[PDB]
Amino acid sequence: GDVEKGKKIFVQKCAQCHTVEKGGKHKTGPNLHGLFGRKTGQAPGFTYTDANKNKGITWKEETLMEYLENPKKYIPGTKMIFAGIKKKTEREDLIAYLKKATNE
Numbered sequence: 001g002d003v004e005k006g007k008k009i010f011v012q013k014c015a016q017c018h019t020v021e022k023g024g025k026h027k028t029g030p031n032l033h034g035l036f037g038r039k040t041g042q043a044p045g046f047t048y049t050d051a052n053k054n055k056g057i058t059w060k061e062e063t064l065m066e067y068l069e070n071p072k073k074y075i076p077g078t079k080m081i082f083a084g085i086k087k088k089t090e091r092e093d094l095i096a097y098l099k100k101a102t103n104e
């Protein structure tokens with residue numbers, strides 16, 4: 001649905017690892033420097049896996065939804081300790097939130 005309905009859940013259980021809207025901090029995942037229509041091997045000084053960066057997929061409304069619904073399965077060895085998001089609303093809410101953070 002909506003940007004409010006996504007930022008409210010991002011700032012709860014994404015910003016805990018990917019601080020961005022509050023101020024950049026890649027403290028347990030890479031801070032989302034837009035991502036939508038960008039690329040994966042894009043983060044500053046952090047460390048994770050080989051898998052995500054080297055293999056890629058282009059981050060977009062498909063791939064990041066497909067990824068957030070199961071990140072461990074979607075890219076081979078991506079740890080990301082959360083792997084789902086309450087209900088399928090918060091999912092599309094996040095997409096439609098972050099889609100502003102790539103043009104606003």
Ligand code: HEC
Pocket residue numbers: 010013014015016017018028029030035039040041042048049051052053064068077078079080081082085094
């Ligand atoms: C800390 C335990 C995390 C939580 C909570 C969330 N994410 Fe995550 N994310 C985490 C890791 C360790 C990584 C690095 C990549 C790897 O392969 O391990 C990621 C990665 C992402 C990405 C992809 C970045 C890329 O590979 O280019 C995205 C788009 C992402 N994470 C988004 C995201 C959102 C929206 C979250 C809240 C629902 C979220 N993550 C939680 C660790 C953690």
